Amino acid sequence: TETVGGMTLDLPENPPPIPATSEVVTATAAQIKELTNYAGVAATAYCRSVVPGTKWDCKQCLKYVPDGKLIKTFTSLLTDTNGFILRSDAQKTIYVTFRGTNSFRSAITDMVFTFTDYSPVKGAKVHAGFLSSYNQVVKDYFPVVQDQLTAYPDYKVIVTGHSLGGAQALLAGMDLYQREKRLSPKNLSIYTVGCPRVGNNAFAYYVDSTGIPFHRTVHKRDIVPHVPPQAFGYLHPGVESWIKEDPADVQICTSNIETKQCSNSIVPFTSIADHLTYFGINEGSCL
């Protein structure tokens, strides 16, 4: 079938098997568990009972944050960007979670690569679409994170998303770092699953300079972390955790600028199907 940026949407038959990986370190069980748990939280955003239902009783909800309390949900129609803030007293965590559209295949096939300037950092540019969506939802969530952190000032803030939601997560994390001075690398972290590239080289260097931990989990041959194209100027910051095969073969490329050794090693034999499951958790349909 079809390609985007030279990469398949549907996997051929007889793709080269995924090549063995021998810096790059195997994730421990504990690290896998933690990536899994925040992948699960990200998955709940696609549940209509959560947004806009405003309940926390979904399957992955009670599995990963059993004592969760929804503080706020929000939706921007124009790009179908949705999210929530949730607090766990048991885990001492304030969660900021986002998605974009659940129409994944069209979203990738129609995506346009145009940059807008990233105004906090001269020379830095981010995908114009992602940034417009962010500028809609920031009004909804930012005051609420400030308010919860005032009320629970010892809690950490975890920002998580799948797919286009991962783009919102990273933009939120950078905004929180910029404007909420009570947050730093000690108490703020960003986790994503199937995150596309979000900005240019300078944006990526900036993100790395903040020291805010940005985790990019990528599931086997998932196309989405490979768009938009590097050749257009885009570059991933963050540390890639690449699920090659569960339950134990998850490889960490510890460098904070994307490398050739994790999921970029399977390009251009990618798939949209691989975008839909992370650690056995369905991402996109609340299954």
Question: What is the dihedral sign for C-alpha 169, 255, 235, 264?
Answer: negative
Tokens of 85: 């803030």
Catalytic residue among 133, 163, 189, 271: 163
Tokens of 260: 């050739």
Hey, what domains does the chain have and what are their CATH numbers?
3-282 (3.40.50.1820)
Active site residue 275: yes
Helices 201-210/164-179 angle, 10° precision = 60
Calpha distance 45→285 (Å, rounded): 9
What was the elucidation method? X-ray
| Beta strands 3-4; 7-8: pairing state | antiparallel
Are 125 and 112 contacting, i.e. CB atoms less than 8 angstroms apart? no
Nearest residue to 39 via CA among 280, 224, 285: 280
Residues 6+ apart with CB under 8 A from 135: none
Calpha distance 106→102 (Å, rounded): 9
**Bridge partner residues of 57 (DSSP):** none
Helices 128-151/164-179 angle, 10° precision = 50
The single residue listed with the structure tokens 């010892």 is 154
Are 148 and 163 contacting, i.e. CB atoms less than 8 angstroms apart? no
Eight-state DSSP code of residue 128: H
Calpha distance 65→57 (Å, rounded): 10
Calpha distance 178→164 (Å, rounded): 21
Chain breaks in the chain (C to N over 2.5 A) after: 22
Active site residue 119: no
The continuous run of DSSP H or E covering 112 comes out as none
| Residues constituting the chain | 287
Tokens of 72: 């706020």
Are 171 and 135 contacting, i.e. CB atoms less than 8 angstroms apart? no
Catalytic residue among 127, 222, 226, 271: 222
Three-state secondary-structure class, residue 120: coil
The alpha-helical segments, DSSP class H, found in the chain are 29-43, 59-64, 104-109, 128-151, 164-179, 201-210
Calpha distance 131→239 (Å, rounded): 22
Are 36 and 279 contacting, i.e. CB atoms less than 8 angstroms apart? yes
Are 129 and 112 contacting, i.e. CB atoms less than 8 angstroms apart? yes
Are 167 and 137 contacting, i.e. CB atoms less than 8 angstroms apart? no
Are 39 and 281 contacting, i.e. CB atoms less than 8 angstroms apart? yes
Three-state secondary-structure class, residue 13: coil
